[PDB]
Amino acid sequence: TPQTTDAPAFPSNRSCPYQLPDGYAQLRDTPGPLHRVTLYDGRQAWVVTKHEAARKLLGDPRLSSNRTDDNFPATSPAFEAVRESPQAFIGLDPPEHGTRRRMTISEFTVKRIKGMRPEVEEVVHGFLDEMLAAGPTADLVSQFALPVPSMVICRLLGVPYADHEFFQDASKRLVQSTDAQSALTARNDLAGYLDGLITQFQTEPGAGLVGALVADQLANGEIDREELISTAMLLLIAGHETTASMTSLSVITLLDHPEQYAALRADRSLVPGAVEELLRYLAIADIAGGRVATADIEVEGQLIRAGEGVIVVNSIANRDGTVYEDPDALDIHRSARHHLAFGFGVHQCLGQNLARLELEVILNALMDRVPTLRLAVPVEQLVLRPGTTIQGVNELPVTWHH
Numbered sequence: 001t002p003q004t005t006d007a008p009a010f011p012s013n014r015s016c017p018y019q020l021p022d023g024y025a026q027l028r029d030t031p032g033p034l035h036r037v038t039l040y041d042g043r044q045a046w047v048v049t050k051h052e053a054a055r056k057l058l059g060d061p062r063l064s065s066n067r068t069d070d071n072f073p074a075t076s077p078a079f080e081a082v083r084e085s086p087q088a089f090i091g092l093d094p095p096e097h098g099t100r101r102r103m104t105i106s107e108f109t110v111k112r113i114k115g116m117r118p119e120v121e122e123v124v125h126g127f128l129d130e131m132l133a134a135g136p137t138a139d140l141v142s143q144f145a146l147p148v149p150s151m152v153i154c155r156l157l158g159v160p161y162a163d164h165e166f167f168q169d170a171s172k173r174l175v176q177s178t179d180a181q182s183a184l185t186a187r188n189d190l191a192g193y194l195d196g197l198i199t200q201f202q203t204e205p206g207a208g209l210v211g212a213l214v215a216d217q218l219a220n221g222e223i224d225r226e227e228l229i230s231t232a233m234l235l236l237i238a239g240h241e242t243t244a245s246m247t248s249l250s251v252i253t254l255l256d257h258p259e260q261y262a263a264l265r266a267d268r269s270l271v272p273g274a275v276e277e278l279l280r281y282l283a284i285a286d287i288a289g290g291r292v293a294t295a296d297i298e299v300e301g302q303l304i305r306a307g308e309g310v311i312v313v314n315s316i317a318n319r320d321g322t323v324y325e326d327p328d329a330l331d332i333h334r335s336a337r338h339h340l341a342f343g344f345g346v347h348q349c350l351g352q353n354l355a356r357l358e359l360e361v362i363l364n365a366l367m368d369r370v371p372t373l374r375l376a377v378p379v380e381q382l383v384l385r386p387g388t389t390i391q392g393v394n395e396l397p398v399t400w401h402h
């Protein structure tokens, strides 16, 4: 009759945009690096819930990133579209992972990201121009948080922004669908589009990273055509959805901590540190922590057995009080160094410094151009995405001094 379990259902949903779900707070407080959970289909898996243990297991080659493994810890039926072959390098292990990742790294270097700053500022202020010209109220998501990173990543990739309604919609359907059929359709829509773009570039060599992969690696048989599609799709979707969620959740969080938001406005040298703290605190991508053991792993007396699924839950690890004193306190002045919002090791987020640039430019622009920005509804009225996808809000009504 008692319902207590030692393998609670995973994932949990946030009720507050920037707070751990109650069940995650429970996992955070329970000693030990690992904890059993039950996934949507009844299967048991391990979650990693402490900070150094998370780094250790992210660096352990025995925890494979191969999503096509039958034992990979899928958290929803929609996962079967990500289990579609071929995998982009996020789903590959060394040595294949490295050969594919190095086809893309040149677009994400510190020198390239620095070169992008004028363009990102132009895009950010252009969409602010438009949203502010029309006056309040507005949905910050559709009008600003999503189009800005979309326009930026399209230029990076060589994908025509003219088609943005098409791939923004497909991107949403892929990331947010709860059934395999809906996800597979969205994936097929994007794949067919990207396959046509490849053919166009074979006719007329094109700009951007897709153009470069077509002209070089594909022409040399060094990447499969369908790998190129998967790779472009990874970057296109991650380029859209991640940054947009950080923007909306950071605005919500900062407006709920007005003393720190005011301190940030008063001293813009605090923005880089504030971005690190917001990344640590909001940790929007637990959905990207899944691994499968290819061999037994001993972890501080607990045994992960070959064939078991393991989810490195970076949001919980980022609230490890042995690393971040008073971990559930937002503190833009703390050292948020070593946070795991981008992962750790060979798969650490390729876009991390583009994301850091965009959030810095965005926060500075909002504080510059809309210092009176405020939510047009109460926080409790917003609808948070579930834990089976990237954290965030699908709409964010805002107003300001016209």
Ligand code: HEM
Binding pocket: 065, 089, 090, 091, 101, 234, 235, 236, 238, 239, 240, 242, 243, 246, 283, 284, 285, 288, 289, 290, 314, 340, 341, 342, 343, 344, 346, 347, 348, 349, 350, 351, 352, 354, 355
């Ligand atoms: C705040 C925004 C973002 C967050 C929190 C985030 C989070 C993450 C995390 C946790 C991983 C590790 C996945 C794993 O270990 O399996 C990852 C990988 C990756 N992210 Fe992001 N990401 C963000 C933005 C972006 C953007 C803008 C891009 C644009 C291309 C991007 C592209 C990638 C890629 C390509 C990988 C795979 C890297 C590899 O496997 O070597 N991410 N991201």
Ligand SMILES: Clc1ccc(CO[C@H](Cn2ccnc2)c2ccc(Cl)cc2Cl)c(Cl)c1
Binding pocket: 081, 082, 084, 090, 174, 175, 176, 187, 233, 234, 237, 238, 239, 241, 242, 285, 287, 288, 349, 388, 389, 390
């Ligand atoms: Cl078929 C297919 C192929 C690629 C993706 C995108 O891959 C990124 C991984 N990522 C996260 C942060 N940086 C990179 C992701 C995975 C899951 C979700 Cl819910 C949201 C995102 Cl943005 C998706 Cl969604 C579906």
